[PDB]
Amino acid sequence: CPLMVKVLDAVRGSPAINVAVHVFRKAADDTWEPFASGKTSESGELHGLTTEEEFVEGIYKVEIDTKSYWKALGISPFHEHAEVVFTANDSGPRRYTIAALLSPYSYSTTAVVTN
Amino acid sequence: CPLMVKVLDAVRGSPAINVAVHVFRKAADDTWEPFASGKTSESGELHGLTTEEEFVEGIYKVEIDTKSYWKALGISPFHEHAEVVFTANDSGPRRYTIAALLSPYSYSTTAVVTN
Amino acid sequence: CPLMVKVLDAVRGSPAINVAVHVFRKAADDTWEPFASGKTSESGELHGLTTEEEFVEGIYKVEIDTKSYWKALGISPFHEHAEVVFTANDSGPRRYTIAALLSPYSYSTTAVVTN
Amino acid sequence: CPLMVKVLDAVRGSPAINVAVHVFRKAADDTWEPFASGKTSESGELHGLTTEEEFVEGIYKVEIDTKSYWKALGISPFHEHAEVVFTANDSGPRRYTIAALLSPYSYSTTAVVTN
Ligand SMILES: O=C(O)CCNC(=O)c1cc(-c2ccc(F)cc2F)cc(I)c1O
Ligand SMILES: O=C(O)CCNC(=O)c1cc(-c2ccc(F)cc2F)cc(I)c1O
Numbered sequence: 001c002p003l004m005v006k007v008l009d010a011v012r013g014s015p016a017i018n019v020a021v022h023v024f025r026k027a028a029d030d031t032w033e034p035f036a037s038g039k040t041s042e043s044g045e046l047h048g049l050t051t052e053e054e055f056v057e058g059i060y061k062v063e064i065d066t067k068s069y070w071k072a073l074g075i076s077p078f079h080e081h082a083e084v085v086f087t088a089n090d091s092g093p094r095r096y097t098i099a100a101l102l103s104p105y106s107y108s109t110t111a112v113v114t115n
Numbered sequence: 116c117p118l119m120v121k122v123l124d125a126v127r128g129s130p131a132i133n134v135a136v137h138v139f140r141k142a143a144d145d146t147w148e149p150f151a152s153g154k155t156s157e158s159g160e161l162h163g164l165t166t167e168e169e170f171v172e173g174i175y176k177v178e179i180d181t182k183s184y185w186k187a188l189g190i191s192p193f194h195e196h197a198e199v200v201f202t203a204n205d206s207g208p209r210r211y212t213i214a215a216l217l218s219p220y221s222y223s224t225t226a227v228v229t230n
Numbered sequence: 231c232p233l234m235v236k237v238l239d240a241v242r243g244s245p246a247i248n249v250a251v252h253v254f255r256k257a258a259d260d261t262w263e264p265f266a267s268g269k270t271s272e273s274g275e276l277h278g279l280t281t282e283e284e285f286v287e288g289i290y291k292v293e294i295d296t297k298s299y300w301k302a303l304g305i306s307p308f309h310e311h312a313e314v315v316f317t318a319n320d321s322g323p324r325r326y327t328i329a330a331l332l333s334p335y336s337y338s339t340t341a342v343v344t345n
Numbered sequence: 346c347p348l349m350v351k352v353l354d355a356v357r358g359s360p361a362i363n364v365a366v367h368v369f370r371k372a373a374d375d376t377w378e379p380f381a382s383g384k385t386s387e388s389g390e391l392h393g394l395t396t397e398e399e400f401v402e403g404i405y406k407v408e409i410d411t412k413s414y415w416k417a418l419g420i421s422p423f424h425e426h427a428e429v430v431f432t433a434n435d436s437g438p439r440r441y442t443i444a445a446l447l448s449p450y451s452y453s454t455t456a457v458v459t460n
Contacts, residue, residue, distance in 0.1 A: 011241060013308055013335030013458045059195060078201050078226040078243050080174060085195040101455055103333040105228075105243030108453050110221035110446055111193045113358045126356060128323075128343045128423050128450030193358055208243075216340055218448040220358030223338050225331055228243045289425060308456045310404060310430040316423050336455035341423040343450075 002055045003036075003088075005046040006099040007064060011075075015044025016102055020065035023049060025058045032061060057089040062098050070104055078105040086111065117170045118151075120161045121214045122179060126190065130159025131217055134184050138164055141174035150175065176200045179215050181222065193220040201226065232285045233266075235276045236329045237294060241305065245274025246332055249299050253279055256289035265290065291315045294330050296337065308335040316341065347400045348381075348433075350391040351444040352409060356420075360389025361447055365410035368394060370403045377406060402434040407443050415449055423450040431456065 003023070007016040019040040024032040036049040062084040070077035082100050097112040118138070122131035134155040139147035151164040177199040185192035197215050208228035215224045233253070237246035249270040254262035266279040292314040300307035312330050323343035330339045348368070352361040364385040369377040381394040407429040415422035427445050442457040 008455060008457065010333035010336035010455055011305070013456045015457065078228070080200040080202065083198040083200065085198065086193050087195065101336060101453070103225075103240035103336070106223065106225035106240035106331060106333070108221065108223035108338060108446070110218075110353060110355055111358045112353065112360065113193070113220075123340060123342060125340055125448035125451035128341045130342065130344070190356070216338070216451060218355035218451070221355035221446060221448070223331070223453060225238060225240055226243045227238060227245065229245070308431050308458070310432065313428040313430065315425040315428065317425065333455075335458075336453065338451065338453035340448075340451035343423070 001047050001049070002052050002093060002095050003049050004095075004097045005040070005049070005062060005064070006097060007040050007044045007046075007069075008099070008101045009044075010101050010103045010106075015042065016040060016069060017042055017044060019044075019046075019069050021046055021049075022063045022065070024061045024063070026061075035060065052093055055089065055093070058087070059085065060088050061085045064100050066100075066102055066107065069102070075104050079107065082107045082109060084109050084111070116162055117167050117210055118164045119210070119212045120155070120164065120177060120179070121212060122155050122159045122161075123214070123216045124159075124184075125216050125218045125221075126188075130157065131155055131184060132157050132159060134159075135180035136161050136164075137178045137180070139176045139178070141176070147176055170203060172203055172205055174200065174202050177213050179217075181215075181217055184217070185219055190219045194222065197222045197224065199224050199226075231277055232282050232325055233279045234325070234327045235270070235279065235292060235294070236327060237270050237274045237276075238329070238331045239274075239299075240331050240333045240336075241303075245272065246270055246299060247272050247274060249274075250295035251276050251279075252293045252295070254291045254293070256291070262291055285318060287318055287320055289315065289317050292328050294332075296330075296332055299332070300334055305334045309337065312337045312339065314339050314341075346392050346394070347397050347438060347440050348394050349440075349442045350385070350394070350407060350409070351442060352385050352389045352391075352414075353444070353446045354389075355446050355448045355451075360387065361385060361414060362387055362389060364389075364391075364414050366391055366394075367408045367410070369406045369408070371406075380405065397438055400434065400438070403432070404430065405433050406430045409445050411445075411447055411452065414447070420449050424452065427452045427454060429454050429456070 009016040025035040064082040138151040140150040179197040253266040255265040294312040354361040370380040409427040
């Protein structure tokens, strides 16, 4: 899998399970087109969003539905979601892991990119 | 000052100076309409974005132009920009400070909301 | 003010008030000798820890008493405290701000060093 | 393995390889006794530090040698190391993953604790 998303809970010290993730790709018309979506597993990970063939060069947006996550735990969080916007595969195919560590009023996101 | 944005550089250990920041407000048709913008000061801060009268309840997006910042320093960045999307609510939180701590492949963002 | 410490709460989206902070300086025998301490203010800041005359080059440790902070709020924390260990150097960096953003199972710390 | 350490590089967007890690356990005499040590692999991970039998209840300190890491890459970083101090196994055996995301003037650490 060339694209994996991992979400972690900084309040509980655990994976963030059942978190909705939507991925979009910027089209020629400059608009965000739907690309893939899924939900994190018991390990806080989301694999299988795409394939090397489908995951061509482009500008991608990964929207992590953090508000729904926090609300379901009784917390009214600051953010609507966490968004990660990046150019992918502009130097050939790479493998991307996008990670987000979540708190009610904060998040930290990083990427690990391998060849 | 109901809204302040502060940007820090984790590579240099300094404020992130001359960073472009664009604020948008969610419209009825769900499109993002320009609301306010500026460039961070020598202290990494951007004040005077809006007034209490103009800063009504609503969904806001703050886009921090991190890619251009890193390009000027000669370090390959991952993100197109850093985005913070939140609902402004009158129920207490009067002053909003959105902070972002920047690295080439990561950012951490928080909100400090005080009465 | 050559040294300032700032502590923020990622769960409440607020300064972390009344947090105990202890600063130590590395001695010849490699032991940590008490140097300065205090409690964060209503703004989450602790100023007046030391003076330019006293703040000589050396290795310093800043211990932020996060466990007690979280216990008072009724949230099970992971860490005993947050520690920041650094060498103070006269070669430019005149003012040191050590910041820590706190969650029950995580913290992010940065330094902003300005002339 | 009940204790695993993962270290990530926020400048390169990669695992942080060959990072020295020392673990200590607080003794009866209130001093830090050596407990385990190792270095992160090509995946930025360090497994095999301890066993369920040896990893008894106690206060542990995980010292991640970040300064040596940054120096070897030509960077003069702010911190001497990153230290993670926590009580372990005080409610029975748990599995701990301690993660640190590194920048020259900043780091973020989190823990994932499973049963
Ligand atoms: O003054 C306030 O309490 C709000 C304005 N500043 C910040 O929220 C802030 C955040 C950070 C910060 C942001 C992200 C992070 F991961 C760690 C941090 F310490 C650092 C500094 I210096 C700050 O003044
Ligand atoms: O395992 C990899 O090499 C890439 C996928 N995972 C992460 O990037 C990752 C990030 C974090 C992490 C994310 C944000 C942060 F501020 C600190 C962190 F330690 C924690 C863990 I456990 C992780 O496995």
